[PDB]
C-alpha cells in the first residue's frame, strides 16, 4: 500500500468532476447530515471511480479537496475498500466468486474456463485491456453459486460454456443479458415456488384488530 509516483499514475494526471459530476457531488453531501462533509467521501470517491476506473493519487487529492478533509483521510478510505481501484481497471473487470458456497457448487470450475477464454492469468488485465479477471470473495447471491460479477452484471448460476458465451457476447457487441442465465427467476426453488404458489392475499388481509 504505497503510491510511488509514476508518470501515468500521479497528479500530473489532472482530475476534476465533470460539470455534471460536480452536480452529483452536491446532492451527496445534503443526503448526509448537515456539517458532515466527511461521510460523503466514500460516495464521492465512488463517483471519482465512476468517472475513471484508475482513480489515481491526483483523483483522491481532489476528493479530499472537494470534501475538505485531510487528504490522508481519503487515502485511508480508498485503501481499505476493495470496491475502489487504485490501479487501471479493465473495461469489463469480471470478478469470480470463490468463497466455499460457490466453490462447493463448482465456483472453481468456472475460473479455469474463464482463464482460458480470456487467455490470461487470474488477477490482471487482458492485453486488449478489455478484460480484467480477479478472484473476488463472496459477492452475495449464493443460492446461485456459480457466479461472475462483471461491472454489476452479477451473472449467476453459470455453467462454464455459459460464461464463455457471455464473454463472447462481451467481446463482440454489448449488454449480454446480465443475470442468472439459468431458467429459474431471481432466486427460486428450481422445482418451483413451494413457499407461495397461491395468490398473494390483498391489502388489509387478516389485519389484526387494535
Amino acid at each position: 500500500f504505497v503510491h510511488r509516483d509514476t508518470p501515468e499514475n500521479n497528479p500530473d494526471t489532472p482530475f476534476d468532476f465533470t460539470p455534471e459530476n460536480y452536480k452529483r457531488i452536491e446532492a451527496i453531501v445534503k443526503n448526509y447530515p448537515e456539517g458532515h462533509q466527511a461521510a460523503a467521501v466514500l460516495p464521492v470517491l465512488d463517483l471519482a471511480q465512476r468517472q475513471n476506473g484508475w482513480l489515481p493519487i491526483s483523483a483522491m487529492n481532489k476528493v479530499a479537496e472537494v470534501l475538505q478533509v485531510p487528504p490522508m483521510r481519503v487515502y485511508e478510505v480508498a485503501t481499505f475498500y476493495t470496491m475502489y481501484n487504485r490501479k487501471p481497471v479493465g473495461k469489463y473487470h469480471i470478478q469470480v466468486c470463490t468463497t466455499t458456497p460457490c466453490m462447493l457448487r463448482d465456483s472453481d470450475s468456472i475460473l479455469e474456463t474463464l482463464q482460458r477464454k480470456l487467455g490470461i492469468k487470474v488477477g490482471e488485465t487482458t492485453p486488449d485491456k478489455l478484460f480484467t479477471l480477479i478472484e473476488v470473495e463472496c459477492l452475495g447471491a449464493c443460492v446461485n453459486a456459480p457466479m461472475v460479477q462483471i461491472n454489476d452484471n452479477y451473472y449467476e448460476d453459470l455453467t462454464p460454456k455459459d460464461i464463455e458465451e457471455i464473454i463472447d457476447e462481451l467481446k463482440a457487441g454489448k449488454v449480454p443479458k446480465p443475470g442468472p442465465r439459468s431458467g429459474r427467476f431471481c432466486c427460486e426453488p428450481a422445482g418451483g415456488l413451494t413457499s407461495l404458489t397461491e395468490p398473494p392475499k390483498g391489502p388489509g388481509f387478516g389485519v389484526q384488530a387494535g
Binding site: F1, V2, F80
Partner: peptide, 20 residues
C-alpha cells in the same frame, strides 16, 4: 499533522504515509 494513517486491512495494514 494529521498525516500518518493506516493503509489497507488484514495482516498488511501498514501505518505509514500513503504517498512518501
Amino acid at each position: 499533522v494529521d498525516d500518518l494513517g493506516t493503509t489497507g486491512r488484514g495482516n498488511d495494514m501498514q501505518v505509514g504515509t500513503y504517498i512518501e
